[PDB]
Design a protein around this ligand. Structure first.
Ligand SMILES: COc1ccc2c(c1)CCCN2S(=O)(=O)[C@@H]1C[C@@H]2O[C@H]1C(c1ccc(O)cc1)=C2c1ccc(O)cc1
Ligand SMILES: COc1ccc2c(c1)CCCN2S(=O)(=O)[C@@H]1C[C@@H]2O[C@H]1C(c1ccc(O)cc1)=C2c1ccc(O)cc1
Lengths: 224, 239
């Protein structure tokens, strides 16, 4: 597998060069966020096709992973943009909202606590792209009966190992001791639990409040 | 604060001794089940397990350093995930089956007489397949279940006292990471393997969190089953 022969720095370079652009709101917030997320989705697809190992998977498996990950990925992008703005969520450069204005207030607070935790930890951009790759490959991997699917799962897990190794390398380069490398790895992956939880809450708050991209839509966008 | 002084070997031992008992389900169930009666057995088992889960939590190194309010907050956020990982562990040796209790072993086809539950089944069965394929060790299971207790609710805290406890929580989590790695090293794993397995284990926790969210919808919708703040409170003060 082409993904599996990459070094850490080559993996990090691939992800960095695949990063989607920071988009702008075009001006009711729900409409502004819906429009913004819809335009963000088109870039997420094309970024995902550039995650090493992702296009080795079958188209069906690619859609399943994107189905499961799409909101976690939008959310981690949001908390990364809002990192250097304590107390505010940087939805877009022209749409920077705070708690009162933001609210739906429960979701808002959890996002602010995620951003603050990333500020606390001095999360680096090279680490962020790795984390967002892990979300793409991990979130749907436990919910795919055949020998093809067994291979696909095995492939995903070996690419996930390659990203783990990449993360460890980045920390070792920054001088962290081995004890500090394992600890910080754990800290990063434990926040991914919180993101899933925020994604699930956002989903159910969407229901109580169509806008979720369908399996067929994702497959159309992936295949075109 | 004795908690952060422990070595890895004494962390394992502390958690192993803290493991709660395996309870039996209600012995006289009419079968086949209906939706109602199955829920009745499961709710009843979960309500009895919850009592023992409190006693275990108070023996997790560092848990009782927290204020009582924050102990409850952590149990509120984690209680279903902990019931689930325990269920997943019990069922490792039973492919295609969930061992709720030694006398309540259920297949996938039984889960569907509860309306929405078969999907959760499907997900809990796959976690037990995963754990079996990684040959998840008991000592690793007790570390993971402790991480859930302290992690699931930490991101929703906090002011100085709050920042102190969140830092105390993360320093215990760091100490359970150190422990997991120590286990992997003595089992002989290369460092590369030690890190890859740690990651593998911690990413499964995100799935467990999904399943809990899934399940919790159901309990609230489609609520009195969920243990209240007062109920947890007070089980905690019964010291
Ligand atoms: O105030 C809120 C906050 C959260 C929520 C609501 C109000 C009401 C219902 C939905 N929830 S939500 O949690 O599901 C969701 C996550 C985030 O906020 C919402 C939003 C969004 C809204 C419409 C969409 O079509 C797609 C996403 C968010 C978003 C958008 C672009 C990003 O790049 C990143 C995050
Ligand atoms: C085959 O019928 C099912 C199966 C799953 C579900 C339902 C029916 C109803 C809809 C919700 N789900 S569920 O996912 O939320 C939850 C996880 C597990 O099953 C449920 C359950 C439980 C049931 C009643 C409660 O009062 C408390 C918890 C579970 C449990 C109980 C004890 C354990 O020691 C470990 C896990």
């Amino acid at each position: 597998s082409l993904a599996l022969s990459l070094t850490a720095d080559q993996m990090v370079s691939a992800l960095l060069d695949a990063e989607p652009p920071i988009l702008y709101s075009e001006y009711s917030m729900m409409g502004l966020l819906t429009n913004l997320a819809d335009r963000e989705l088109v870039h997420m697809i094309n970024w995902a096709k550039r995650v090493p190992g992702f296009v080795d998977l079958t188209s069906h498996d690619q859609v399943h992973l994107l189905e499961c990950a799409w909101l976690e990925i939008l959310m981690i992008g949001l908390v990364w943009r809002s990192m250097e703005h304590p107390g505010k969520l940087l939805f877009a450069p022209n749409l920077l909202l705070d708690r009162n204005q933001g609210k739906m207030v429960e979701i808002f607070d959890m996002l602010l606590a995620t951003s603050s935790r990333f500020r606390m930890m001095n999360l680096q951009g090279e680490e962020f792209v790795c984390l967002k790759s892990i979300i793409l490959l991990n979130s749907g991997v436990y919910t795919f009966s055949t020998l093809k699917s067994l291979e696909e799962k095995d492939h995903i897990h070996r690419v996930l190992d390659k990203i783990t190794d990449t993360l460890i390398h980045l920390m070792a380069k920054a001088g962290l001791t081995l004890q500090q490398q394992h600890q910080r790895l754990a800290q990063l992956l434990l926040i991914l639990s919180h993101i899933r939880h925020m994604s699930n809450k956002g989903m159910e708050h969407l229901y109580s409040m169509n806008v979720v991209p369908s399996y067929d839509l994702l497959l159309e966008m992936l295949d075109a």
